[PDB]
Write a protein that binds this ligand. Structure first.
Ligand SMILES: *[C@@H]1O[C@H](CO)[C@@H](O)[C@H](O)[C@H]1NC(C)=O
Ligand SMILES: *[C@@H]1O[C@H](CO)[C@@H](O)[C@H](O)[C@H]1NC(C)=O
Length: 115
């Protein structure tokens, strides 16, 4: 089974396997596709981070590198960095995936508009 962000921010979800090993670049694209999504771009993860999205996992994006979005500093997540941090790695390296849902328009898929 796959782990997925409970609430997507600017259409972005972190997607990973429930146990290691995680996913090379090809596997990451395939995982998003199996969910009916696409691999997110760096720009899409940056937009999510600016809207409050952070994780403790590096994940593949469409530019063929991996990123981690960080808002608070934690030594276990991006070595206390803040921002969208980049990891240039071979396409064979295992990471999670950032997927983008083009049907999302709410900033947070769990927070509706006022009804
Ligand atoms: C990615 O993993 C798949 C197995 O799911 C493998 O067939 C493929 O060669 C791998 N690609 C790279 C670049 O490591
Ligand atoms: C994508 O978003 C739509 C609309 O919010 C939702 O119904 C659908 O389940 C989402 N799919 C995934 C894989 O998140």
């Amino acid at each position: 089974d796959l782990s997925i962000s409970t609430c997507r921010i600017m259409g972005v979800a972190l997607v990973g396997r429930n146990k290691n090993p995680q996913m090379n670049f090809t596997e990451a694209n395939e995982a998003c596709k199996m969910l009916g999504l696409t691999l997110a771009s760096r720009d899409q993860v940056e937009s999510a981070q600016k809207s409050g999205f952070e994780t403790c996992s590096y994940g593949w994006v469409g530019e063929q590198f991996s990123v981690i979005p960080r808002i608070f500093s934690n030594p276990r997540c991006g070595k206390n960095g803040k921002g969208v941090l980049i990891w240039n790695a071979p396409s064979s390296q295992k990471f999670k995936a950032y997927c983008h849902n083009s049907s999302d328009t709410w900033v947070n898929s769990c927070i509706p508009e006022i009804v």
